[PDB]
Amino acid sequence: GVDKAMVTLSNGVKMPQFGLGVWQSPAGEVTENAVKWALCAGYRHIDTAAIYKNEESVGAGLRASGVPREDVFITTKLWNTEQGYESTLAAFEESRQKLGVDYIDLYLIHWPRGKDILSKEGKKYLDSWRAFEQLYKEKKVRAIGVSNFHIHHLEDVLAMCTVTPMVNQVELHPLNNQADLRAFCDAKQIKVEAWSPLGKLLSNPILSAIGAKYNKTAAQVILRWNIQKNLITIPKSVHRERIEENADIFDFELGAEDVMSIDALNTNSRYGPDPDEAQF
Numbered sequence: 001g002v003d004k005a006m007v008t009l010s011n012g013v014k015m016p017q018f019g020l021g022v023w024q025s026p027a028g029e030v031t032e033n034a035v036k037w038a039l040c041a042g043y044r045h046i047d048t049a050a051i052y053k054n055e056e057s058v059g060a061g062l063r064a065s066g067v068p069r070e071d072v073f074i075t076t077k078l079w080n081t082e083q084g085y086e087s088t089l090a091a092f093e094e095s096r097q098k099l100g101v102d103y104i105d106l107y108l109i110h111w112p113r114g115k116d117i118l119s120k121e122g123k124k125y126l127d128s129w130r131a132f133e134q135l136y137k138e139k140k141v142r143a144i145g146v147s148n149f150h151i152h153h154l155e156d157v158l159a160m161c162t163v164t165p166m167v168n169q170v171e172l173h174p175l176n177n178q179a180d181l182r183a184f185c186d187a188k189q190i191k192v193e194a195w196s197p198l199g200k201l202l203s204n205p206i207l208s209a210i211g212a213k214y215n216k217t218a219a220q221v222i223l224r225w226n227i228q229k230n231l232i233t234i235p236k237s238v239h240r241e242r243i244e245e246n247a248d249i250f251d252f253e254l255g256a257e258d259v260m261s262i263d264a265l266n267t268n269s270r271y272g273p274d275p276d277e278a279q280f
């Protein structure tokens with residue numbers, strides 16, 4: 001079930017495979033309610049970021065839910081402008097105080113930053129990674145990873161790390177299924193987590209026809225496909241009925257032909273920025 005499906009990270013930490021994204025959920029009551037409703041529906045994983053400016057609301061929603069903090073996995077992320085060693089330690093402290101927690105479960109570098117910034121300012125994600133390693137040694141964070149890293153960015157970290165990144169959270173859905181990145185990450189025990197897992201994609205005729213066989217929606221089909229590919233998935237919604245619907249994917253299974261038809265939809269088409277080309 002949604003509270004029970006887990007992926008074991010390389011350091012043995014159990015990370016719930018399914019969580020609530022609060023990307024683009026407004027700070028205040030909207031985020032508090034989304035978090036509270038998700039926890040009440042059995043979610044045990046919330047994904048936020050400093051740049052979402054809603055970490056206070058995530059903490060407030062968790063407190064409102066009455067679910068013990070030790071039963072919930074909280075991920076947050078270092079924003080691009082704060083990369084660097086001392087600045088990363090500071091950013092982490094600010095995120096921690098806003099969430100109202102003593103420890104964070106997973107901390108991610110949000111982006112590597114685009115190639116023109118790397119060329120002018122250097123690969124500051126490497127020194128941020130050293131600061132992550134220090135936070136992990138100090139027991140301030142249970143797991144560390146990255147977001148929006150391509151294979152080449154990971155190779156840069158793997159050449160210098162004392163602790164391998166445990167998660168890489170990237171744009172991943174049936175139109176951009178990240179097969180090559182997933183093969184590399186599998187080789188290096190880096191778990192792949194899908195952002196924007198639902199991407200007009202939810203009107204796709206193949207997807208809704210598959211859903212019709214199991215009395216599921218296209219969105220539920222996409223999320224079940226995430227689960228069967230052993231991916232971590234964090235669909236975002238602020239609406240209670242959608243938050244509950246998205247998690248109701250553990251009572252059905254996609255067969256081989258279904259999964260093949262979904263894999264066939266790939267076009268390597270991104271809705272979000274390409275991490276190499278980003279001008280931020």
Ligand SMILES: [Cl-]
Pocket residue numbers: 255256257258
């Ligand atoms: Cl089949």
